Amino acid sequence: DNSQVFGVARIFASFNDTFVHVTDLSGRETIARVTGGMKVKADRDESSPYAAMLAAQDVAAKCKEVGITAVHIKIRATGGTRSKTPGPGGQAALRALARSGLRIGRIEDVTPVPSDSTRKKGGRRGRRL
Amino acid sequence: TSHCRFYENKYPEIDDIVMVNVQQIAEMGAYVKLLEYDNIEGMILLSELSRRRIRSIQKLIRVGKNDVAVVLRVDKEKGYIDLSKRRVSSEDIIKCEEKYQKSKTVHSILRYCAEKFQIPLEELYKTIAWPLSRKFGHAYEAFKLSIIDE
């Protein structure tokens, strides 16, 4: 190591209100819980890339204040029962973290996936929007 | 002269709740005066206007009335107010109503002197407002205590 302060970004990117929540290597001690909805006013563009980008920039400022420079991102979607698909905001949050000085390492896909559990929501014919 | 803002300073603070008076609508939204803070114009954007979908606009703004809202960002350099109507709690709406009525009562009280003695309203309100609003609460309780014991 080059005397680095490693961290984990572990982005959670649903289809609404992208989450950015950095913690230590132990994963227990949280830093900069600020999310996408924190930085947008509509309460509905929370999934938009702008919310995630501003959240990531504020996280980066907090990390520079606390010394964490290089990161280990754990990209997450809602997964499980819900669509198994990454949200649009989380990727933009990851890019914004990449820009603002910080360094990356070992980006991970930590999407929780079931082995056909949980007879899940929707009914037979499913969504009828 | 209806002037000389109710509270300590002319320029509204951040994320603060107000009730506003509507005067005109150009095309985007409406930059309308305020009777909760100093009379500097505060502008509402249509994205932050109606809880229901935007199909009729003249019935929800009702130009020339009092409407509860909350100011998002304030420009204290030369005077621009970004003002928002939607994200207001159903329980804080009562807070806005009561606070606006209290400030209205203060305005009504401290106008009689300025018009009876033709002295500056701003000067008299500046003299009176130091023990008035900042002591520990609104003026009305202080005025009632004073009439029962000055």
Binding site: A70, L94, A98, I104, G126, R127, R128 | -
Partner: protein, 102 residues
């Protein structure tokens, strides 16, 4: 009338198939008539591969990818442009539409 010889199902000898739930509309549908797309994707796009690269220790990273197998319904698939209504004589061509990227 017989629209498709294979009944548009692709079961033909199983009697019953285990249903699967659509990714978007959440409709239960037989797993064979559950039009399926292997969404194999790089975890970030080319507009950010650079941004991540110069902000990366461990030069020339493998940049791990994300894989998924989307089990659409048919209504979502036709609505969300995955499957297209083709002409009568062109239905009988089951090859993928000619090398998406060449």
């Amino acid at each position: 009338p017989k629209k498709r010889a294979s009944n548009g199902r692709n079961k033909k000898g199983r009697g019953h198939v285990k249903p699967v739930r659509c990714v978007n509309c959440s409709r239960s549908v037989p797993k064979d008539k559950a039009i399926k797309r292997m969404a194999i994707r790089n975890i970030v796009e080319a507009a950010a591969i650079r941004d991540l690269s110069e902000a990366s220790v461990y030069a020339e990273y493998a940049l791990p990818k994300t894989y998924n197998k989307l089990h659409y319904c048919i209504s979502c698939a036709i609505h969300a442009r995955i499957v297209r209504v083709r002409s009568r004589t062109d239905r009988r061509i089951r090859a993928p539409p000619q090398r998406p990227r060449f």
